[PDB]
Structure 1
């Protein structure tokens, strides 16, 4: 009697990296994901692995994109 299972891969630490209402630097990472669960908003871009990152210095806000969708944006408030 033996087992065929036992295998798993190293866990990838996905999820949100910055909080709503916080000030971030020029190129801070905001969200790690597979696919598009959250869309890039104002002043926010997508990386090659779907990573969302900021492109200015400002405060970050999570928003709503119509229905069943949502987006995150950065605003340059000083």
Structure 2
């Protein structure tokens, strides 16, 4: 059926090396793909958001469990 349709969104919002801020949202997902790392809190829809300022660092331990972190500048 050519009926129904859904715009949807999702994806990563703050990539690597990006200097974020306390409140910015990092990535929007549906499950636990990118898991909350150091200085990275996780909303109810599995959304990652920053707790302070820093540099978005990415971390891949061979797929399976992704992690994002933040290293302050100062």
TM-score by length of 1: 0.84
Count of matched residue pairs: 74
Q: CA deviation at 1:66?
A: 6.4
1:8 Cα offset (Å) = 2.9
Shift of 1:62: 0.7
Distance 1:8 1:31 in 2: 27
RMSD, aligned α-carbons: 1.5
Q: 1:72 — aligned with what? A: 68
- The answer to whether 1:28 aligns with 2:27 is no
1:50 aligns to what SS in structure 2? coil
> Which residue matches 2:42?
46
Question: 5+ unaligned residues in a row in structure 2: which ranges?
Answer: none
Computing the radius of gyration from Cα coordinates, the structure with the larger value is: 1
